[PDB]
Each structure stands twice: as C-alpha cells, then as structure tokens.
XYZ file of C-alpha atoms in Angstrom:
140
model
C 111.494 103.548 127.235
C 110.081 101.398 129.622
C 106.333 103.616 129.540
C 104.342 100.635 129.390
C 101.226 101.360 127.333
C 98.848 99.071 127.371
C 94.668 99.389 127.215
C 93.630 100.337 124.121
C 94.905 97.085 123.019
C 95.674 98.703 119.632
C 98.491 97.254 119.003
C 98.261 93.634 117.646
C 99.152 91.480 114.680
C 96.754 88.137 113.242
C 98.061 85.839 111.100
C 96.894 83.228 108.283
C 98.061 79.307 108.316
C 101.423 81.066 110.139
C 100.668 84.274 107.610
C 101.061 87.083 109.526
C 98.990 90.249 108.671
C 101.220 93.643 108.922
C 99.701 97.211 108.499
C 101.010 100.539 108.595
C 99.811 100.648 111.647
C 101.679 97.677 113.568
C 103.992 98.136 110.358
C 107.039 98.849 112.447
C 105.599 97.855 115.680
C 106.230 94.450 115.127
C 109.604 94.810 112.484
C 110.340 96.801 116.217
C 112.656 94.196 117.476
C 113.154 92.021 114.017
C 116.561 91.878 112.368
C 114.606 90.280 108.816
C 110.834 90.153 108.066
C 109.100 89.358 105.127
C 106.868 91.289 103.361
C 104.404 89.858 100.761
C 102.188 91.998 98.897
C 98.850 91.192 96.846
C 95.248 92.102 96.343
C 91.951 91.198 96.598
C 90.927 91.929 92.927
C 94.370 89.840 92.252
C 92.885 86.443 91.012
C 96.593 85.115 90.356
C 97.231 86.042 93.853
C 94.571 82.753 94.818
C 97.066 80.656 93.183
C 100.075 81.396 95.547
C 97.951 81.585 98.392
C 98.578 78.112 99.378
C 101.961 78.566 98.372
C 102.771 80.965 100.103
C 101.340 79.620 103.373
C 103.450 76.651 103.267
C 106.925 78.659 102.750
C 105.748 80.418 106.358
C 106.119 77.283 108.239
C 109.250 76.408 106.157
C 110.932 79.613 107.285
C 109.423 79.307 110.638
C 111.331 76.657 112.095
C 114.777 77.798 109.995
C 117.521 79.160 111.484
C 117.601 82.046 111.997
C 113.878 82.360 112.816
C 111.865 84.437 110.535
C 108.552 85.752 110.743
C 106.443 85.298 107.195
C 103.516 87.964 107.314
C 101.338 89.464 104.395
C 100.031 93.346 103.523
C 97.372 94.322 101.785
C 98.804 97.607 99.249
C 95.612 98.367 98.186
C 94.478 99.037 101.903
C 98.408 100.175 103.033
C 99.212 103.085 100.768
C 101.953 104.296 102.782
C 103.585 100.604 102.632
C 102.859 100.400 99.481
C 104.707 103.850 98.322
C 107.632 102.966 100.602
C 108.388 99.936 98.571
C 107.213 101.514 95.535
C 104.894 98.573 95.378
C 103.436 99.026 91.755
C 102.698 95.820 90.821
C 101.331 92.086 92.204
C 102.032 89.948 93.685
C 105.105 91.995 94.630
C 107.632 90.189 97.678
C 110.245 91.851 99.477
C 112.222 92.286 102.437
C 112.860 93.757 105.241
C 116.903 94.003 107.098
C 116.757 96.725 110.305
C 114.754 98.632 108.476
C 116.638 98.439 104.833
C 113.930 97.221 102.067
C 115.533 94.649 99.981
C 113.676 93.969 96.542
C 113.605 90.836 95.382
C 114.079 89.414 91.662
C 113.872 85.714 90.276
C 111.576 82.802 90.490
C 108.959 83.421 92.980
C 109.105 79.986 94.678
C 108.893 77.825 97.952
C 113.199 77.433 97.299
C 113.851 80.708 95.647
C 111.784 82.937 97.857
C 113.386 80.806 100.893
C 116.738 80.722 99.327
C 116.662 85.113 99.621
C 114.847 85.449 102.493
C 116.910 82.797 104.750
C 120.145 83.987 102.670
C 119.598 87.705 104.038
C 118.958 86.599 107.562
C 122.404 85.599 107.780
C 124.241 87.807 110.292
C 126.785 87.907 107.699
C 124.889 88.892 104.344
C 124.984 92.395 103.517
C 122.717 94.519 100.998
C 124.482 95.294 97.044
C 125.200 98.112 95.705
C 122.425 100.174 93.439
C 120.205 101.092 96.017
C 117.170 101.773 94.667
C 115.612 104.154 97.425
C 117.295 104.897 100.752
C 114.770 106.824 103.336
C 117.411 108.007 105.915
C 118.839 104.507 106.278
C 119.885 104.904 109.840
C-alpha cells in the first residue's frame, strides 16, 4: 500500500455521454474503492443493443446525481471473456451489478425506472443480497 505506480499510465477508464467503459483490465481497478457499480453488457453485432443505447445513456446521468452516487459504465463481452464468464454473461443485452465485489443479476423490465429502481435500491447501505446464489467466487 501506498507504492505509488504511476508511468505507464495503464491504468485508465473513458466513458460515453457519462457511460463509463470497464475492462478486465481496469475491471477491478476502478470497482477498487466502489461499494455498487453497474455493469451493462452488449455487442457490436447486437443491433437491438442501438436501441437502448440512448437509453441507457440517459439512466447514467439519472443515477449520477442520486444518492448514493453511482457510477454507470458499459463492457464489451465479446472483447471481455473473463467478465463475461464471471457473470456467466450468455446472452444480450445482459445488466447486472456489482456490491463489494458480490455480482447481483438482475430480472424484470429493463427500463430507465426499473433498472434505476435495482441499481439505486442495492446501493442502500442497508439492502442486502437474497438467498439462491447463483455463483459465489470466494465471496470474501
């Protein structure tokens, strides 16, 4: 702790309209120091993916200046395997979530309220993953 390792200047994130991009490579560099991030996947040959887009872009900003903060970014599965295989990703456009490091999946009506409605629901200090996991990779 405390190394300070900075030249390369490797490690960075972009973003989209407030759309982060995430990779396996600043995958958990930047969920470092996040108690909830959001993960949305999708694809390039994913034509119904064009549609959200937009829709998407403006449920960043929404959950941008909510309380508590949260920081809406994007990932690529088809160029992130290993992302992809840790949320068993097999389908798009596939959403989901990220508490400390426990992937929540998400199920319902993927829109500007529902998505929001999880997302800023698990934030809460207070809200606490269900039963059924469905895959635990040494949670802890």
């Amino acid at each position: 702790g405390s190394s300070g390792s900075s030249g390369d200047d490797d490690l960075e994130v972009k973003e989209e309209n407030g759309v982060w991009v995430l990779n396996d490579g600043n995958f958990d560099n930047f969920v470092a120091d996040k108690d909830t991030v959001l993960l949305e996947f999708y694809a390039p040959w994913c034509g119904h993916c064009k549609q959200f887009a937009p829709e998407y872009e403006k449920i960043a900003s929404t959950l941008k200046d909510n309380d508590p903060p949260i920081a809406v970014a994007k990932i690529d599965a088809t160029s992130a395997s290993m992302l992809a295989s840790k949320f068993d990703v097999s389908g798009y456009p596939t959403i989901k979530i990220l508490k400390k490091g426990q992937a929540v999946d998400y199920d319902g009506s993927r829109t500007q309220e529902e998505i929001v409605a999880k997302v800023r629901e698990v934030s809460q200090p207070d809200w606490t993953p269900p039963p059924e996991v469905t895959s635990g990779p040494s949670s802890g």
